[PDB]
């Protein structure tokens, strides 16, 4: 019954990881100002280069140097030496409107709650209850270690860190009844910018103990766990410079770590009637009141739309076979208890609030009890 | 026992879509030249500009301006009453070399079949015997309503046809042991780019007359289907002037549309020594030969590396309980049978070969019989 799963993450200064966060960074500036924004901000990340494209329609006065610029100060880029300089390097913009014949179809003269969808499309929620957050550990424990590199490079414990960091983590489980178990850690995986200085010795002994060990419990890790700590030897180029980021390239990394299912759909820089974003919360916040509410182990739920249409065309339930209820009486537990309108979402969730950046980086679920993190009491 | 399930296919024109295949044109013309190309081409589009971003290092001389306009005139967007126009359209190249430090650490003085893994990363490959081509019918269906759009366009069938078009198919499903069997089409959405001449109802006729009708069995069509035809009720607007596109942001309409699951990794403008693509290729190739060597009817693979090394890190199977035998023993039978290094799939699935456009638009999956959809003849 054992088998292997594997999960990633990166950091703040991995270049998708920018993108997200900047193009959140702007979506949040608009809110600020305005509400009811309608965001569509891409970003693109290269050498010395942020251009932001995309379509903004918003009451809001938005200056985008001087948001672009303070989210890659924050992320760490300050200084050409480490590949990217917030100070210096070049923003483009090239913002439009959003498209009259999309905002006809969806919001013009519309009743909020009765706004409709801003495309089609599918979008996944799950959870399970193999940690108290109910998300897959191999998932939490990759964040946890990108999470931990920028708290000692922040602090000055290991000074040769640079934002730029992937991780990966591959957990032996065991099941029972459909419900995962987690066994022991079967390898780890990371790799991080560094400067010129360090030597590749001394980066993977600080690594495995103030990095892996500060955050993997010490009963997952035995004799036989495979450590590939930066395994290519030599990670001084990173950042935008190493690799092109563009927003909308992590989606796995800002869910679920290959569990579960993902509709396609990017969740940064867009507004709440973007239901790529608001029904993937939606439906993560379905999910995790399933399994906090003892009807599920782990659960896998769907839902899909059309653009202008506000009621969800379709909601499915998989429950791996962890509930005594069939999946047929879970989705009517769920069609009593949810409304999952764009127009209903944005009320339940709060989702005008300026709170997305925060979202941008180490997953968007299983953190600090977002509105979509807060199980609904279930009526049955 | 049943359930509904959706997926969604997208256009030629759709932006996202048009950035796939000009980052596999531009992989095709160095693989042209130079079978050993190292290509990570990213292409952001919005009105009249396509940018291309990201790292190649090869012997190839690419004249970047014509590869990108000849794929947009392939595509059909060739005046600026489309808005989008290759002869017209800004062309912008921000390509560097491959970081060197990538280079040492993957493949510089490696034997190619030990080349290491170009990334770390998860993969999947699924296959489902609900189709003879092994993919689910609702992505199945989502791709051939935008394959006949296309064609109806080109044909001069629909002349106010435009480029830019989405598609998404709900079907009602019942289950036997795990296999999933399609009973009938619950809810299609069909979104198209149109001229500003022709009315709602016309297309709204047509849609259903000449596109659906020739496309899905009238057996799966009843009183009950529900049509979302146009349902933003006008798309003059479309194209990168609607909506900016980026490569790596249709990964699902790429893959299998909700079912299986993902990696994270986008699959247009790599080379075969990024596993995201070549080691997601493999996997499907091991789903679909254990589906139609009859060891399972529908199946999931997971596969993981690290950064410059070459086996993989983990390799994993889920057969939703549609095999007599354990997921244990099919591993067994995959590692006997398969070698996932990307030095060794390179030679399996022929990846130096410039076919990659081809892949760009329609999944890269269920198609064509490239060598990934050839099973192989297992032993044990
Ligand atoms: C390996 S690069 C992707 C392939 C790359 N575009 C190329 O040209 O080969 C992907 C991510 O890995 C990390 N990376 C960059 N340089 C690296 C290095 N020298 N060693 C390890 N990881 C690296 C960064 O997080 C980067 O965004
Ligand atoms: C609806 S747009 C995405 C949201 C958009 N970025 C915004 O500013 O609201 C996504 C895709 O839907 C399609 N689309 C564009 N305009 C549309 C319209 N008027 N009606 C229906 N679909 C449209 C195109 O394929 C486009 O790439
Ligand atoms: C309980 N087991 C055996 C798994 N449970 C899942 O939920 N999935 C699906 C992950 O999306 C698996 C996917 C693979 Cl490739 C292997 C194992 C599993
Ligand atoms: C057989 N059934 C009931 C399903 N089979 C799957 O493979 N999955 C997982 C799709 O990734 C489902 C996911 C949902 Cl949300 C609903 C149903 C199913």
């Known amino acids: 019954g054992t088998f292997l799963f594997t999960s990633e993450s990166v950091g703040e200064g991995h270049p998708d990881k920018i993108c997200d966060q900047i193009s959140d960074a702007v979506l949040d500036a608009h809110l600020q100002q305005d509400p009811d924004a309608k965001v569509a901000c891409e970003t693109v990340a290269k050498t010395g280069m942020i251009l932001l494209a995309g379509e903004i329609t918003s009451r809001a006065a938005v ?50 709650e009765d706004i409709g969808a801003g495309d089609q499309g599918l979008m996944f929620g799950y959870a399970t209850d193999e940690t108290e957050e109910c998300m897959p550990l191999t998932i939490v424990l990759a964040h946890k270690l990108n999470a931990k590199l920028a708290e000692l490079r922040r602090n000055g414990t290991l000074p040769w860190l640079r934002p730029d960091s992937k991780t990966q983590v591959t957990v032996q489980y065991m099941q029972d009844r459909g419900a995962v178990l987690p066994i022991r850690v079967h ?98 916040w379905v999910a995790k009141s399933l399994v906090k509410g003892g009807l599920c182990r782990r659960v ?69 009890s977002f509105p979509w993190e807060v199980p609904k009491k279930l009526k049955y």
């Not at 100060?73 to 300089?85: A, E, L, Q, T, V």
């Not at 360090?198 to 890790?221: G, H, S």
């Not at 990394?253 to 507004?271: I, L, N, P, R």
Request: proline letters at 3%; charged letters at 25%.
């Open 300 to 368: 896998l739920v769907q839902v899909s739309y059309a653009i202008g249409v506000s009621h969800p065309l379709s909601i499915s339930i998989f429950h791996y076979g962890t509930s005594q209820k069939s999946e047929r009486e879970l989705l009517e537990i769920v069609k009593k208890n949810f409304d999952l309108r764009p127009g209903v979402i944005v009320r339940d969730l709060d989702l005008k609030k300026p709170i997305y950046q925060r979202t941008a980086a180490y997953g968007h679920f299983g953190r600090d």
């Open 187 to 284: 390898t780890i995986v990371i790799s991080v910018q560094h400067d010129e200085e360090v030597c590749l010795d001394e980066m993977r002994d600080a690594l495995k103990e103030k990095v892996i060990k500060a955050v993997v419990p010490a009963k997952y890790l035995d004799e036989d766990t495979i450590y590939h700590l930066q395994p290519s030897g030599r990670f001084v180029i990173g950042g935008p410079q190493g690799d092109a980021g563009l927003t909308g390239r992590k989606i796995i990394v800002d869910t679920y770590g290959g569990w579960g299912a993902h509709g396609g759909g990017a969740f940064s820089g867009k507004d709440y009637t973007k239901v790529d974003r608001s029904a993937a919360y939606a439906a993560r």
């Open 63 to 112: 200056d985008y140097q001087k948001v672009v610029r303070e989210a890659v100060k924050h992320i760490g880029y300050d200084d050409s030496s480490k590949g990217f300089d917030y100070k210096t390097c070049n923003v483009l913009v090239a913002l439009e409107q959003q498209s009259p014949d999309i905002a006809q179809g969806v919001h013009l003269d519309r009743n909020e």
